[PDB]
Backbone:
């Protein structure tokens, strides 16, 4: 794909492969979060669906990056996908906190790649990230922050009851 | 606009300009209330929307007054709009209380203008206020009183939980 | 909102609050322009509507900035809104000139904020301004320049007649 | 989930987790196959789509297994996902051969799990595999065998031309 | 148009005029490619249409640049349009290669203009190019690379036959 | 294309290539006229659109000639396209006069080609020109003459006002 490649550095090509791995890892983590909340002894369907939807969103992000890698003439390379950091995810506020930490990590990775593209004068890359990822992240993180505030306000009053109310009336 | 002006005193013309300023100040206050409840660390969307809707209603009131000023041949004159009295608005009951205080202030201003128009035998003014403002205020104040009673009943039981329930099930 | 805030400088947060104030001031100015042209002794309905529509557009810009401030985890802070620079706005060309001066001032403010965001490596901010504001301004300024040329061409021939024709056939 | 678990052995629970890992690994492999054929220097869109569709099918299989794990009261546990066995996948017949090897491996895993469930008198497990997986595999393997025969017949005549014809007229 | 011009350098204004010339030259080249493939002794209608469609796309790009030149207050200036580099365009792979060379030249010109706008802190220009041109080019170049790979694979097997198949089944 | 060519002289083939160049030059001129009237300091949208529509009509004429060249078995050959005769086009009557001069030049070229075809007993050529070009030109020139008369009548009364009225009420 040296035939189409233009203004696409090796540094960016590698960073894009790393970012694909991070998005796939995030999707895997959300798959685990979703099925945890689907357990009969956890049983919060709104939370299960929230995280399962996010697994799909992160996979879609990876696929968009891969499509872009090929559009630019870079070579997609896949690495092992490490398993999620936990096997069990605690309460709703525990899970939402872990999700915010995860999204901030992806966001920082996006910002770092943007900074690299800017240094290398790669405006297509910079536009691609801004158009498809940066605002998606900002909106998602705001939503999770809103959720966490509501969950914390609820479980501060009464833990079990608050978790049920949030799952029923928000999610 | 001396060409159309009839039975429209300078006192009423000035009072109408003052009232426009008060309605615009009220709209600004509601804009601030709305965005406060939109913060990720407050996060009560029903409350945000309630106040944002009221910002629009107050602006519309100002515009109606301005249209009327011109219909009567008076000259619209604008003054600085002072910023809202608070930067942060506390809890839902705090905000609803501030809103009731605000509306009673507008209502008193409307009543004072009505009394002026009555003293000056300006029935068009008196009809205009009765038809477009006085009942709107009475209905709004009743609604906010109903809200405050419900919020107080809820937060008296359990603060955080009560605020969430009200935002979800009333607003 | 330290819980969601990431890569969002205090300098940008403050500049966004200042920009909200500028957009609200612009909206207020357009409200005054609109009602001036609605006076029975000015009476150019197309001009009144043109400026009233712009009052709405500027308010919407402010609201978008406020939404963004919260999305990023900054704190919206409101200041007094100074009244418009004039109480009376002269002829159509006078008003259109004042409008172009106003828009160039907002545009420069947008460019200054963009430069700040670029210096601080805040690509979300830069994208936000480019996507929602920069082109809107360029298009609006071009439209007002087209208008001013047409108005000037018309009032150069015959003042009163030219103003009427422009209001009727362009606006 | 000891509260719902009945006739569900630890051996089957573990084997189901292993099978989830195998289906996710297969999905990952198909993702890599799909993006390989999407490269500008490979450029067989029908082949890209064939494998991308299979990535989705394998992920869906994993999700069904996970849903079943929870339905039975077992605990879903995730392991690292090893990267695909190749970074580049050769020609269409090379890729289809690798795909048949992959599917036979999944099929054997399904048969082994079925044999385990049969030995443990777990008819729900046995029915689940028969209803959702065993025939899906048989049909898919038959389709890939049909494909490979056609591809081999074509590239035996003329390699490049044959690959293009197959991608255009079959896929 | 000194009346609307703001933050728009003479360097960018001139570069935009040069870019218009390049897009018009590209459109002219594609017109020639299209009519070459329409000759009764070449006779590849899918190839004719592919290039005629691109002539239209390049002309549209020029028109968008011209519209933008005026929106910014610059002065559109036209230069002679040099004729295409060839009178006859060889085989399908010859033509597709020439097309890729042409598009890479336009792309480099776009990147050079973007770099200029970035150096001059002209974010409207940079956004304009990113939004309307940079990705269009990346997508087009990827498509042409995919085409060239397929054509080369086909004519490597059997020249005449391969050209016919590609025109029929891809274009 | 000696395989299809019949009764098609080298003189006509060359003249057709020259005519294509003239139509493309005319289209380029109209592109320049259109964007001139789109400038913020000229700003006559009806005039801009009138000339932009004519740019399209002339390009379409060129394309029809090229299609015909190939239908007859001649070889399309392209030459440089000289830039338009002016960078700035004055007032509406100035531009309409230049347009009439341009169209009369194309018309004379069409008549000269018709005379050549008649001398060479090429009835297909003669029919082609009569059916697709000669009446189109006569109708267009009549329309431009009608326009010029109206514009001249208007600007004779009052220049600026007259130009605005014509753009608004005719174009």
Residues:
């Amino acid at each position: 794909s040296s035939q189409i490649r233009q203004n696409y550095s090796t540094e960016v090509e590698a960073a894009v492969n790393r970012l694909v791995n991070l998005y796939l890892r995030a999707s895997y983590t959300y798959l685990s979060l979703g099925f945890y909340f689907d357990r009969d002894d956890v049983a919060l369907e709104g939370v299960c669906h929230f995280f399962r939807e996010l697994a799909e969103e992160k996979r879609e992000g990876a696929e968009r990056l891969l499509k872009m890698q090929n559009q630019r003439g870079g070579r997609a390379l896949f690495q092992d996908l490490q398993k999620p950091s936990q096997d069990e995810w605690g309460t709703t506020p525990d899970a939402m906190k872990a999700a915010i930490v995860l999204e901030k990590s992806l966001n920082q990775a996006l910002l770092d790649l943007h900074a690299l593209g800017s240094a290398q004068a790669d405006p297509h890359l910079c536009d691609f990230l801004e158009s498809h990822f940066l605002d998606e992240e900002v909106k998602l993180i705001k939503k999770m922050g809103d959720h966490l505030t509501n969950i914390q306000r609820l479980v501060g009053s009464q833990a079990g009851l608050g978790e049920y109310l949030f799952e029923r009336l928000t999610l």
Remarks:
- Residues 123-157 of chain A form the longest helix (35 residues).
- Residues 1-171 of chain A form a domain with the Ferritin fold (CATH 1.20.1260.10).
- Helices of chain A lie at 10-37, 45-72, 92-119, 123-157, 159-169.
